[PDB]
Subunit: 190 residues, 6 copies
Amino acid sequence: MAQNLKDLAGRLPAGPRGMGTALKLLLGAGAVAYGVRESVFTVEGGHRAIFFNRIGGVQQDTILAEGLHFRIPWFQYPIIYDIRARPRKISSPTGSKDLQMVNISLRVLSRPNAQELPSMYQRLGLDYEERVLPSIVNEVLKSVVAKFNASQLITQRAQVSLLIRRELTERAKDFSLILDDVAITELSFS
Amino acid sequence: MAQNLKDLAGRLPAGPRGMGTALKLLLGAGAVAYGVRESVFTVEGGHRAIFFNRIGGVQQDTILAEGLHFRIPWFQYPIIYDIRARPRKISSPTGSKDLQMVNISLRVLSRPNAQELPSMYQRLGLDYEERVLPSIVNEVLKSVVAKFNASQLITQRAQVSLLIRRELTERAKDFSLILDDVAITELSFS
Amino acid sequence: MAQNLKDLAGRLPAGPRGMGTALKLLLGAGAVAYGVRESVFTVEGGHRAIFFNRIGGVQQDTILAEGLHFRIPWFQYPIIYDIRARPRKISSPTGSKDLQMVNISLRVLSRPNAQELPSMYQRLGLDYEERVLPSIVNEVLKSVVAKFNASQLITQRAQVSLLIRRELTERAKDFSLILDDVAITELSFS
Amino acid sequence: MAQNLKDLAGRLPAGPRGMGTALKLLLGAGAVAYGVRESVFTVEGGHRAIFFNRIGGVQQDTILAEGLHFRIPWFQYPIIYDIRARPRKISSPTGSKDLQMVNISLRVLSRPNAQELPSMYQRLGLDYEERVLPSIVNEVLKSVVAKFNASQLITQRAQVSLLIRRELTERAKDFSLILDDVAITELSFS
Amino acid sequence: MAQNLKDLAGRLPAGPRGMGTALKLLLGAGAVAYGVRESVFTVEGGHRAIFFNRIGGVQQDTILAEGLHFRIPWFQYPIIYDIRARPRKISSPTGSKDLQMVNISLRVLSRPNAQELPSMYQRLGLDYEERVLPSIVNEVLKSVVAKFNASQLITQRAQVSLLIRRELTERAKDFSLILDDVAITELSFS
Amino acid sequence: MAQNLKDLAGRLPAGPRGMGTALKLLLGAGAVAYGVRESVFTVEGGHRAIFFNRIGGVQQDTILAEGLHFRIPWFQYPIIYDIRARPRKISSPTGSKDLQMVNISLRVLSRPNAQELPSMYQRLGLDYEERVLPSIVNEVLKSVVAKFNASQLITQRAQVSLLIRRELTERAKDFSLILDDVAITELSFS
C-alpha cells in the first residue's frame, strides 16, 4: 500500500523520447568494443598476471599463474611478462691455470617453471634478464676458466660444464626460481 | 477465429518509431562487423580446434580437425595450436664407453598429424616442449653413449643413427601419439 | 489501362521519413568498405583462387589461375596460397660406399608451373611442401649418396647432381606437375 | 525577363532536413577518407604506376615513372612494383674445357632506371625475376665454363668475367631496357 | 545606420535546429582526427623534412633540420628520409699488382648530418645508399688492389686503409654531405 | 536565498530537446577514445620520460624514471628512449710498439641508471652513440696498442683489457654518467 511505488512506474513510460535515444547509445558501445578488442586484462592463457599502480615503482617483466579476474578494481595496471625462445651465447678465450690459450663459453636458459614472478619482480634487481643474464653467464665463466685446466678442457668441452653445472644452479636460483639445463658449445685455442 | 492474431501481424507493417530508428542499427552493425573480421572462433579449415574455460586449465600446442563449431557456449575459449617449423638440436660429446671420448646426439620432432590434441594437452604438458626436448634428447645420448661405442665412435652417426631412433621412438610417442621422423647431425672428436 | 502504374511513379517525387534516413545509409556504406579493404575474395596480385565449404572437407594452401568472380555464391570460402622465395637446404654427413665420412647438401626450388593446386591440394597429402620437401630431398639423397662414391665426390660436388636430377624429377612430379632445377651445394669430409 | 530563373533561387530558402542532413554528408566524407588513408592510386615516393583490367590479363612486378593521376577512370586496377636491394649469388664448381676442375660464380643486378616495366610486364612472361635470376646466371655460368679454360680462369676470376660482360649485356637486354654491371666473386678448386 | 553591427547579432541565432545540428559537426571532427593519428607532416624530433609537389621528380631520400610547420600551404607533399644503422660490406680476394691474391673489404657508415639532403638529392639520383655504396667502395676497393701489392696487404689489412682513407674522403663528399670513417675489416688469400 | 543562485538552477537545464542532444555528445567521446588507445603520453612498463618543445630536434635518446605526468602542457612533446640490446664490436690488428703483428680490440657499453638522460640528452648529443662508439673505441685502441708491447698483450687478451678498463671508465663516463662494463673479444696475429 503506497502511492510512491505506483507513481514511479508512471515515470518509466512517461517521456518515451528518452527510450528512443537509448538506441544511439547501443551503437556507440559496438564502436567502443573494437578499441577494447585490441587490448584486455584477463590473462588469456600460457601467460601469468602481475600488479602495479600509477603512483609507485612499475613492475619489471614477471608472470605467476592464470586466474579469472579483470583490471576493473580502482588502481591496478596492465603489464605482464610473456615467455619465448631465448638466443644468447658467446665464445670467450681465456686461460689462467695452464698457460697457452684456453677458451671457455657458457650460456643460461630461461624456463617458465613454478610461479613466483611477482615476488622476484623487485627482488630480481634492476632491469630484467639482460642485467643478470650476461653477468651470471660471464661471472661463472670467468671464475671457472681460472680453476679448470686447459689439458682437460681440450679433452671435452662438455666436461667443463659438469663442474659449472653446480655453480650455475645456485646462481640463477639465487635471483628467482626456474629450471634451466647446463650445457655449452665451446671451442678451445692452441 | 482469434482477432488478436490479426492485431499482432498488423504491427509488422505498422511499427512504432522503432522502424525508423531501426535504420541506425543496420548502419551500426556494419561497423561492429569490422571488429569481428580481426578475430573469430570457427576454425578456418587448415587448423584444428581446442577447448578450455576461464577457470584454470588453459590449453595450447593442440589441434584435431575442422568443423563449424567454436566459442558458441559460455564456458569456452579461443586458443589453438598452429603448425610451424621447429629448430632445436645440439652435439653432445661424452666419453665413457671408448678409449678417449665419443660424440652422440639426437634431435626430436613433433608433428600433430591426427590423434586428438586436447586429450594430450594436459597430459603432454602445457608448453612442456622445451622441457621434454632437452630432457629426452640429453638423456638418450647419455644412456646410449655408455652402452657401447669404442670403435663405433666414427661409424656411430652412421650405424647408431638407427639405435638412437629405436629408443627415441618409444620416448617420443610416450608423451603423446604422433607420426614424426627424427635424425641428427653428429660429429665425433678424435 | 492501369492507374497503379501512375501511383508507383509518385514514390520518387516525395520527402517522407525514409528519405531523411536514406542518407544515413550512404554514409555508413563508406565505413563498411574499410572492413572489406583489409580482406576480399577476387584474386588480386599474381595469385590463384581455390574453393571449399564449411564441412569436414577443406581447401587451403593451393592456387590455380586468375578469374573475375566474388565469393558471394552461397557456400564458398576464401583460403588461397601465395608464391615467394624458398630457402630450404641442409648439410648431411653419411658415407659407406667408400669411407665413413661424406657430407652432402641439396636445395629444392618452388615454381608454380601451370596450375593444378586444387587437384594436387588433397592429393599432395596433409600439410603442403613442408612434408614432401624434406621427405624427398632427404630420401633421394640418402638413397643416392649410398650408391655414389666418396673419391668421386671430391672430383666435383655437381657431378652427383646429374644422377639425382633423373631420380628427383620422378619424385617431384609424383606429387603434381612442376619444373624444378637440380643442383647441390655441398662440402665433403675425408 | 525569365521567371524560371527566379524560381530556382526561391528554392534555396526552403531546405528543412536537406540543409540539416546535408551536414551528415560532410562528416561522412572525413570517415571515408580513413579507408583511403591505408591505400591509394596516385603513386608516391620513388615508385612507378602500372595498369590492368579485371577481364584483361593482370599487370604486376613492373614500374614505369611518376605522374599525377587517380585510378578513377572506369576499368583500371592498382597493382605496382617497388624497388629494393637484391641479394642473389652462388659458388658453382664446373670443369670441362680442362682436365682439372674450375669454378664459375655469377649474379645479376636489377635497376629501376629507364622506363619499360609495362612493356616488359607481359614480355617478361608469367614469373618475374625468380625465373630470370637463376636462369641467366646458371645458363651463362655453365655455357661460359665449357668454352673458357681452367688454367685461364684460375689466373684471375675477373679475367673470365670480361668475356661474360659481352654476353650478359645481350641476355639482360631481354628483361625490358636496363643496364647491368658484370662482376662476380668466385673461388676455383684445384 | 551601423547595419553591420545589427546583422552580426542576427547571425548568432540560426534557428533552434541550427545549434542542435551544430553538435553533430563537433563529433565528426574527433573522427577525422583518428585517420590523422596514423600519419602527419610536422617532422617529430629525430628526423629532417623534405619538400615536393605533384609535378615532376618526387623527392623522398632527403632530410632538413627540424622546424615547426605543417603540410598545409597549397602544393607540398609528405615524403621524408629516415636515418638508422646500416650494415653494408663485402669479403673477396682479387689479384692484379702481384701474382698472389690481394683481398680488400671496407664498410661505410652513415652519420646523422643535416647539411642539405634536398640540394644534393636531385644531384644524387635514385638508389643513393644502394648504388653509391658499392660504386664508391667496390670501385676504390677492387681498383686499389692493382695499385698496392699482396705481400704488403697480408702484413696488415689496416695498413692499406691509410691510403684509401684519403680517397674515401673525396668520394664521400662527391655525393651529398656526410662524414665517413676510415677502417677495413678483411681477410686475404695466399 | 539570492536570486542569482536560484535562477542558475533554471539555466542549467535546457528543455527536453537540449538534454536529448547531449546524448550524441557522450557517444562521440567513445570514438575519440579509440584513437587514444593506439597512443598516449604517460610512460608505461620499465620506461623513463623525456621532455622537449616544438622548435628543433633534441631530447630523444633519454629515460629517467616513472611518475604520472606526461604531455600535460602545450610546449611538451612525446619522444622517449627505450632500453634494448646493443651489438657493437671490432677486432683491430695493428703493430707499432713491437716488431711482429699484435692485435688490440676494445668495446664500450652504455646503460641507463637513474636521473641522467634528461641532463645529458643535449651534452651527449641526439643519438650520437654511433659516432662516440667508434670514436672512443678506435681512439683508446690505437693509444693503448702503441703504448704496451705485443709480448705482454699476446700473453692474454684479458691483461691488456685490465689496463684499458681505467682509461675507458674515464672516457665512457665523460659523455654521460652511467654504470656499464666494457670487455672485448680480442684475437692476435702471429
